[PDB]
From Swiss-Prot:
Organism: Homo sapiens
Consequence of substituting residue 74 to E: Suppression of integrin binding. Markedly reduced activity. Markedly reduced activity
Record note on what altering residue 105 to K does: Enhanced integrin binding
UniProt protein name: Interleukin-1 beta
Protein's GO biological process: apoptotic process; astrocyte activation; cell-cell signaling; cellular response to interleukin-17; cellular response to lipopolysaccharide; cellular response to mechanical stimulus; cellular response to xenobiotic stimulus; cytokine-mediated signaling pathway
Length: 153
């Protein structure tokens, strides 16, 4: 791993955390009280990619598990999904556009664009208890912004 990983959690702009309600399924909802222990933790890693001025390609891989978020097409329709990669070869300096997310910073908020399908970012449903997914809606009603938080281990 000739790179630098970063342990950090993720929260939406409405104050909600992400939880692994299933193997390859995550859900974003309100979390508070001792029930916070039900919060997942990702591991951001700075990788190589379209190094722009505000674009920072990284890799979000569950710390404990070896699942790496990936943008795949489901009938010509981009979507978000968890794909178990090699727990030995990953992470690394280079990554497939699928595991590469351009971390952008706008209005003091973060926006992850699928290095594979530009214009499509990671969004959540304002609704309560809903699976996370990839949406092609810059703002509007879908919550595409987010908030990362460094942690320790």
């Amino acid at each position: 791993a000739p790179v630098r990983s970063l342990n950090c959690t993720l929260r939406d702009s409405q104050q909600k955390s992400l939880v692994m309600s299933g193997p390859y399924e995550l859900k974003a909802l309100h979390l508070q009280g001792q029930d916070m222990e039900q919060q997942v933790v990702f591991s951001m890693s700075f990788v190589q990619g379209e190094e722009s001025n505000d674009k920072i390609p990284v890799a979000l891989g569950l710390k404990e598990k070896n699942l790496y978020l990936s943008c795949v097409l489901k009938d010509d329709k981009p979507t978000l999904q968890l794909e178990s990669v090699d727990p030995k070869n990953y992470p690394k300096k280079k990554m497939e556009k699928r595991f590469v997310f351009n971390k952008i910073e706008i209005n003091n908020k973060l926006e992850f664009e699928s290095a594979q399908f530009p214009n499509w970012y990671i969004s959540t449903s304002q609704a309560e208890n809903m699976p996370v997914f990839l949406g092609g809606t810059k703002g509007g009603q879908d919550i595409t912004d987010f908030t990362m938080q460094f942690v320790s281990s």
